[PDB]
A paper describes a structure:
The SLFN14 endoribonuclease is a post-transcriptional regulator that targets the ribosome and its associated RNA substrates for codon-bias translational repression. SLFN14 nuclease activity is linked to antiviral defense and platelet function. SLFN members are multidomain proteins comprising an N-terminal domain (NTD) often associated with RNA cleavage, a middle domain (MD), and, for select members, a C-terminal domain (CTD). Here, we reconstitute active full-length human SLFN14 and report a high-resolution cryoEM reconstruction of the SLFN14•RNA complex.
Residue numbers in the entry:
A (entry chain A): 3 to 156, 180 to 350, 381 to 517, 526 to 684, 695 to 839, 848 to 882, 888 to 906
B (entry chain B): 3 to 156, 177 to 350, 381 to 517, 526 to 684, 695 to 839, 848 to 882, 888 to 906
The structure:
RNA sequence: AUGGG
RNA sequence: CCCACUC
């Protein structure tokens, strides 16, 4: 994407302007001021394009060989242009430096802060004119923006007797117009040197001024102080040609429309005949412009962007479009504080897993970095298998890894370690990676400061300079940059993205539980309904903690009752409250129990007693809590519950938000829900499949989900499937994932052992644990029935060649591989 | 409060600027620039003060006696100053008219729209500076505001210029014409001495560079250096004394105003030293260095160039005041509906509102209708709004010499305030009317939020029977009149009057509708609910709307919906509107309701289990199918001395508290809150302590501030029966004069045995100048009954007569706007 | 012929 | 000198 530019390989868009004279004394002295104006304009449009296109560097060549910036300054008209381009301070966006015979102007990206008008893009001139009293004022960016917002939500005696001059036809010589110019009246006189091109150049800024503000009459052929009518000789210009010229000129004036009818600008052009002693003398031309509905331009706006490495001018429609233009930003401070703290205790390498893998694979890398970063009292280094891939651009096999250094009083450095020293693509790779990383930090993270990324290449067995303003001055800039990094990684998919998404979901669960806990004081018996992918177990744990906090009771007096033993073990590892299985709850003695929470009441079996009646008798000796969590889409046991009929299941809620899966997993869940609703099954009643809405599910999905991967393969063999699993596992472990991330689940339990053996061979070509091993550092290989209520970040679903996709997707967070 | 101004009695603040020359050519051809600048400046300060202080009219005397505005124009320098004061449009705020030898400038009130930045006031020049590259730019109003919010929100390069310049102070000895190797940048500025005057020009120039230094990055300023040569020439021995030193500038720089978002309040720091110049190792002169460190907050070169009106004088704004006024409800949501249902902008005829006050006026005076009809004629559209005193409506003055006021609003016409006088011999009417118009206009802007140009022209009419404004001050289309009437609705909803009372009642109707819409969600989430209601929540309307929702959500006839209450009067009230059965609890028992599907029960607190179990009966009816058993409870309004059949409060789930819904006045709500606090401090016996814990004062504060409206609550004590009757008769007569109706008044006696007596004692006092029982609310009569029989119903005006205590809550609950507690 | 640097 | 309205 970037050019070659071997002389200065800056990781930015570089605009070369040519040869420019510099120096205050030098600039004050020229002949041929056209060259001076052109040299000012070129740099100004370059600055405008760079402000509107994400920043960059401007390259100029110095004519004076003995020139020195510290002794000659910069100029005087250039500073005036800078003031007229950046009214609220030009220092925050421009810097100047001198590399020998080169003058470099560093331009920051234009982004308004939280204390400013919402002015999205920078312009020299709005080029849409307004009328104040009698002068046509070219509006500024802010004034034009206010006018656009005005039209989006959609003294006088001079206007009289102007239409009277419009009405009459015959004129003698030297009529003293009794009315002077006003908002609706303005006049000029002809120029005998050139008439038609002067009218070309002069009409637009009055036609636009009238069309914008009320409506007016342009009179041409009238003097200022004498207030008479003069005109030019008839032989100089034919009136019909002039009228046609005026019509075609007005038709070419750019226009924007907030309405739908798209009317053209309505004007009336008339020619008169100024006589002299009953002899034809000349013409006076009158143009009446009514108040137009929407904004009328005189020329294209003085705004520029960068397209195809060229400084181009924005059109009217484009200019108006970009002129008028999440929970990540709410929790980014906490995420940065917990994941990327800014301390003074040496330098910390992140993430721990990938760094451990890289340092175990190569011992010299740790010392090589600890010597390269030195001298640095404090800082942060973030590693990645491919920072280009993490951003989402490219993946190079010749690169071992990339590191990012962020520290105070220092710029940001991008280290690129190469497996092979003589590979000729390292420098371009590092430069482009720095460019795309900075661009993503700006356009996504929201970093409005000044920062630079320096590419550096490094070999296993083994200089650009910026303005000092482009270095992280203090710790606050470090925090802002790291929060932008948090946003950028949460927007992408990688190992760090997965870990930070887990932290994000943990933060969101607390808010959801706090909101849910308000119903504790409003209800005693409740029937909570949960969508596919809600994580009812974490909600239940937080609810038990809140019950213990609100009702001042011993944790032993709160009973969690579930169906599966693995979920019970997970829960007793989590909460101090008592947790029993359904079979233990029955044929059991519970006399000192006040509050009961039931999860997985879907699969409760009534073939051993009435569990609902037992719970009601326990909570109704005092009136205790009897909250039931139900997800009617996850019924596996072929038995009815002790549940009362759906009409008697009141009061109830419908937890819609709580989707802590990837976007594609949520898509699969939504499609499966639609399929189930279209063709209801036997064990799911129509009444219960009516409280879940697809629109609400989509709204909850595009408020908490994060990017991930779902991939389905069909018509595969056992050995091929095992090899696929082994290869994907190997790639993940290389990228930094842990064994306690992955879980392989087979639909049929009897297919476990076989699928185990083919696994042990596959990983041999390139240790599995039961369902009570999800907290250990091993890959879990079990069945869907035995894995109910648990979850892991990467899930491999094995099933022979069908509404059970949802049971697989409910067990996964970011990666779901469905192999048939 | 306005001045006399017999010549032009505008209802505006008029600023007389003096004897001023006008003309596009008359100002050009004129010497004595000290006069041109003075007149331009005076007019500009007047415009700025008017813009920042509500608008008005500037009056000037034109120099040329042949001057005509349409011929001679306004000028060029004045127009440029107008452009520099209002960057985005001046026609929106300034109009000009000529009356004889007077030029009047009509100045609108600067009010930022929903588009522009929050620039609250207009500024000619902020006078706080910035650095840029090598410059000192006076910040515009917008950029200055940006800087204030930013500051309160708390091989060679350019930076090399600081080096080789920070070491200039260390150069204690200096030799004549030494070259300087650094050029001007963001950290250095040097100026050349002036031979004629040295001190005054230094003092003029220092503040506006010290401001930029202290406001952008710091730095230092030299004096004695040339721009074209970088000399060290400086002054001489005989023209500069050692008096000009650090101490001398220690007062000039300290004269600069400084604001501070900080608490340390540090004065600006500067150090001055003298570098001697040596022409051939001989002293020749001195050059000056002043080092200015950057400031934590803003530093002002001068006082800001902003003006307001104080004591009818154009008064300059200091830095603190300027920065303070630069950085500084559901009525606006419902005003569109209120205006379209109360003031429909149509063309069928002229609408005289309010109707009750108009009826009283037209019955007290038969000829008022014809005089009014002739006053606006010829006309086709508009609304005429009548009042007993429009000055008193906006809360300023009540006059016994004025019969009534009329406000005419029409398309292609300005607002006209008519003042009707009983006796023309009264001389002071004119001023009154004028002032009133002024006040009304201001209320339409500060309170009503109106932005466009409007003028209120006062006229004086007698029973036994010209100000000029710009054309732009007349209403243009129907949308303009709609916005003006919406502003009027907003203004009146914050005042106390008849029109305010009716608007508040309809406001309460809309609020109740939205509250019931919110409450209808719980019909999808539960079957039996225990709704706990604050005092003054108007639960009966909620119940009516709830059955309206049940009839649709469950597609069933109104027959299978039941209302259960305690009083027969409220049963009739409810059965008046609702199509469902509405029977009291006594007849609900000893009866059979087999077709009933859903039951809504009101006044559940005073239900008595002396005839069985009503709760079990309702439960068994609703539990044959699972029906709805919503129960509304008000624990603070227990009257009956009976034990309910309700389940214990620990078994009254699921439950919800309707905290919001306060549809009374601010003072009535305050009385309610005080009674709540008194009750909670000393709990009674008929209410369980557990139930007196679901109610918090803060939520009541929020609801009252969000929904209540200003009203009247007066308590009189130590009175006899005749005095109370006289008070009631006088208040009723005065209210009927104001335009009220008997259907808004309820006189309630605590003890029922006091009723008959309080009838006769009343009827005498009223006869000095027909009643209804509590079951007469729907009739057009004044009800005189007890609060026990009026429980559950409401009236706008309540007279609570009580013998000489926790029962003020009932009286406050039956009242909407006016409460008069007589003991 | 009008203001800001 | 630079810039803005301006015949
Ligand atoms: Mg003009
Ligand atoms: Mg002209
Ligand atoms: Mg300078
Ligand atoms: Zn349009
Ligand atoms: Zn401070």
């Amino acid at each position: 994407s970037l050019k070659t530019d071997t002389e200065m390989p800056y990781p930015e868009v570089i605009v070369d302007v040519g040869r420019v004279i510099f120096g205050e004394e030098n600039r004050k002295k020229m002949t041929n001021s056209c060259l001076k104006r052109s040299e000012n304009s070129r740099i100004i449009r370059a600055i405008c394009a760079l402000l509107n296109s994400g920043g960059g560097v401007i390259k100029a060549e110095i004519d004076d060989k003995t020139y020195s910036y510290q002794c000659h300054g910069l100029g005087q008209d250039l500073e005036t242009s800078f003031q007229k381009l950046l009214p609220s301070g030009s220092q925050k966006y421009l810097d100047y430096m001198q590399q020998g015979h080169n003058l470099l102007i560093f331009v920051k990206s234009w982004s308004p802060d939280v204390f400013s008008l919402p002015l999205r893009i920078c312009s020299l001139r709005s080029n849409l004119y307004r009328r104040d009293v009698t002068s046509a004022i070219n509006l500024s960016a802010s004034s034009a923006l206010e006018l656009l917002r005005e039209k989006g939500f959609r003294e006088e005696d001079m206007r009289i007797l102007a239409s009277e001059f419009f009405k009459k036809d015959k004129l003698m010589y030297k009529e003293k117009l009794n009315f002077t110019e006003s908002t609706h009246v303005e006049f000029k006189r002809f120029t005998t040197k050139k008439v038609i091109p002067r009218i070309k150049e002069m009409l637009p800024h009055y036609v636009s001024a009238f069309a914008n503000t009320q409506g007016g009459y342009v009179l041409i052929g009238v003097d200022d102080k004498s207030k008479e009518v003069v005109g030019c000789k008839w032989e100089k210009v034919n009136p019909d040609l002039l009228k046609k010229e005026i019509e075609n000129c007005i038709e070419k004036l750019p226009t924007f429309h907030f309405c739908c009818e798209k009317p053209k600008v309505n004007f009336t052009t008339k020619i008169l005949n100024v006589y002299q002693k009953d002899v034809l003398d000349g013409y006076v031309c009158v143009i009446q412009v009514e108040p137009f509905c929407c904004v009328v331009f005189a020329e294209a706006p003085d705004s520029w962007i960068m397209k195809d490495n060229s400084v181009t001018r924005l059109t009217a429609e484009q200019w108006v479009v970009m002129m008028l233009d999440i929970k990540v930003h709410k929790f980014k401070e906490a995420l940065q504080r917990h994941l990327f703290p800014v301390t003074q205790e040496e330098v910390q390498f992140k993430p721990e897993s990938l760094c451990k893998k890289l340092f175990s694979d190569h011992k010299e890398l740790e010392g090589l970095m600890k010597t390269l970063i030195h001298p640095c009292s404090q800082g942060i280094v973030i590693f990645s298998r491919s920072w280009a891939g993490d951003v989402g651009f490219r993946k190079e096999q010749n690169v071992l890894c990339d590191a990012l250094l962020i520290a105070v009083n220092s710029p940001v450095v991008l280290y690129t370690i190469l497996i092979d020293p003589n590979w000729p693509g390292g420098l371009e790779y590092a430069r482009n990676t720095a460019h795309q990383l900075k661009q993503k930090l700006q356009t996504v993270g929201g970093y409005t400061g000044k920062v630079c990324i320096i590419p550096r290449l490094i070999h296993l067995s083994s200089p650009l300079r910026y303005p000092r303003s482009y270095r992280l001055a203090d710790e606050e800039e470090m925090e802002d940059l790291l929060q932008a990094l948090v946003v950028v990684s949460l927007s992408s998919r990688s190992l760090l993205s997965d870990q930070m998404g887990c932290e994000f979901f943990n933060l969101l669960i607390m808010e959801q539980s706090q909101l849910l806990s308000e119903s504790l004081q409003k209800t005693r018996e409740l029937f909570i309904y949960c969508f596919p992918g809600v994580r009812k177990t974490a909600l239940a744990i937080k609810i038990m903690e809140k019950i213990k906090d609100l009702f001042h009771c011993k944790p032993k007096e709160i009973l969690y009752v579930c169906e599966s033993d693995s979920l019970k073990d997970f829960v007793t590892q989590q909460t101090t409250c008592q947790a029993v299985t359904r079979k233990t709850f029955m044929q059991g003695e519970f006399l000192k129990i006040k509050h009961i929470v039931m999860d997985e009441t879907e699969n409760f079996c009534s073939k051993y007693g009435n569990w609902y009646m037992k719970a009601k008798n326990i909570t109704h000796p005092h009136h205790g809590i009897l909250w039931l969590f139900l997800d009617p889409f996850q019924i596996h046991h072929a038995d009815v519950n002790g549940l009362p009929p759906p009409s008697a299941q009141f009061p109830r809620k419908t937890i819609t938000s709580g989707i802590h899966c990837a976007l594609e997993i949520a898509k699969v869940m939504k499609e499966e829900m639609k399929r189930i609703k279209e063709n209801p099954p036997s064990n799911m009643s129509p009444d219960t499949l009516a409280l879940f809405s697809e629109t609400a599910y989509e709204e909850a999905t595009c408020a908490q989900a994060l990017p991930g991967v779902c991939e389905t393969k069909t018509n595969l063999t056992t050995e091929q499937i095992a090899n696929y699993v082994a290869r994907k596992c190997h790639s993940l472990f290389q990228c930094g994932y842990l064994p306690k991330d992955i879980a392989i689940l087979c639909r049929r339990g009897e297919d476990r052992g076989r699928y185990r053996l083919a696994l042990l061979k596959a990983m041999e070509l390139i240790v599995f644990s039961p369902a009570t091993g999800v907290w250990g550092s091993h890959i879990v290989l079990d069945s869907i029935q035995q894995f109910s209520g648990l979850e892991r970040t990467v899930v491999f679903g094995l099933s022979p060649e069908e509404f059970h996709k949802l049971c697989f997707a409910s067990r996964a967070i970011k990666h779901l591989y469905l192999l048939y």
